[PDB]
Amino acid sequence: FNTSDYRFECICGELDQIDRKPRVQCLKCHLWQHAKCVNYDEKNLKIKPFYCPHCLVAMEPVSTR
Ligand SMILES: [Zn+2]
């Protein structure tokens, strides 16, 4: 019974390590994406909250009745 499939990786499918490309660990859905793939940076990763683009859209209302 499929409720939530546990596939979590950055949408480019290259790496996930701040050595090469900075990465945000989207706490809201345990999704490991890149900062420079979600329009974010590692400098404020130290400070501010960080998510994958789908969680932004999901917090926003959907066009339906
Ligand atoms: Zn990426």
Ligand SMILES: [Zn+2]
């Ligand atoms: Zn997310």
